[PDB]
């Protein structure tokens, strides 16, 4: 970028998840963690 | 960048991850931690 | 960057992780911590 | 950076966690610390 | 940075943890810590 | 439970309601309350 | 529990309520009252 | 619990009530409290 | 609870509300309080 | 408890209220109390 | 409005607009802003 | 309003927008402003 | 309002913005502020 | 208002905006200023 | 206002602007203040 205005983003080798909740919940998970 | 304004943002290897909860929970967890 | 304005911003090998909670919870947890 | 004004951030290998809680919990940990 | 104005911020090795509560809480730690 | 790890949840005799909304409201209520 | 670790949560008789609310609103409530 | 380590939690005759509110609100309530 | 570590909580008859307000709020509410 | 370590906590008959504000409010009470 | 109670809302020449996002967004927007 | 009481609210000419966000964001903006 | 108790809020020309943000973000931004 | 007891809030030409951040940034804002 | 008790708030012209922030920032800034 000669006398320019970049904006360049090289992403690689990764992992995006996302989960979303809005209702209750009414579980009883006895072996393993929950985050909510 | 030469005489330039750049912005480049070079990322590798990493994870993103994220949880949302609006409603009540009910549960019970015994073996395992739980962060909210 | 000659006579110019950079912002780079070089990354790696990190984890990033997010939580949200906004209802009321009724849980009893025993055997781990619990950080809110 | 030859007459320049740079602003990079190498960063590498760390952990970022967050968690939020607005709402009131009713719990009772008995082993395990818990940080609000 | 020869003439020139630097802010690098160089970090590695190193782990940031937050955690927010704003409702009341209701427990009874018996074993273990407990900082707010 | 006799040397085991138990998690039951008696529960019984109970309402469990939710609500949500994102989008903007146009009303006007004179006669009663309104949460939000 | 003989030599156990039990998380057992007897609950009745109870009531369980969410409301959750993200744009703006515009009403008018003259006669009662309106926690948000 | 002989020898044990138990996390009971007996609740009844309760009410949980919540209520989230993120967007800016235009009403004018005359007659009646509001809490937020 | 003999020769144990018990981390029991009875609760009876108690009400837990929760408010959360975020946004700017334009009211007026002349007759009857208002606590942030 | 004999020989033992307990943590009860017995509560009966009681009320616990929060309210949270963030944003900028624009009111004016003038018959009644007003505690931010 | 005699002898009366009355909650009228007259509004006029205005724009009420909302957008909502949930899910991580992957963008890069070089000419103009983006407010989220 | 003769012996009367009455809540209107005379509203012209005004803008309401809002917006919402939830998920990680991973963008970079170069000309322009970003508030959230 | 002849013995009367009114609230009338009159309100003209005005723009009223909100923006939530609950993720983590990622950007960077050279030219441009950004308030959070 | 004669023997009365009014509220009225006349506003005009103003701006009322609002931001919230809840979660870890990560950014490099080398040109403009940032208030959180 | 004849033996009556008003409360009117004339406003006119004027701006109002709230920023929150509570996880952690990682930035850094070279050209311009940050107040916080």
């Known amino acids: 970028c000669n006398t ?3 904006a360049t983003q090289r992403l690689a080798n990764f992992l995006v998840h996302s989960s979303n909740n809005f209702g209750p919940i009414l579980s009883s998970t006895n072996v393993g963690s929950n985050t909510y």
């Open 4 to 6: 320019a205005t970049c």
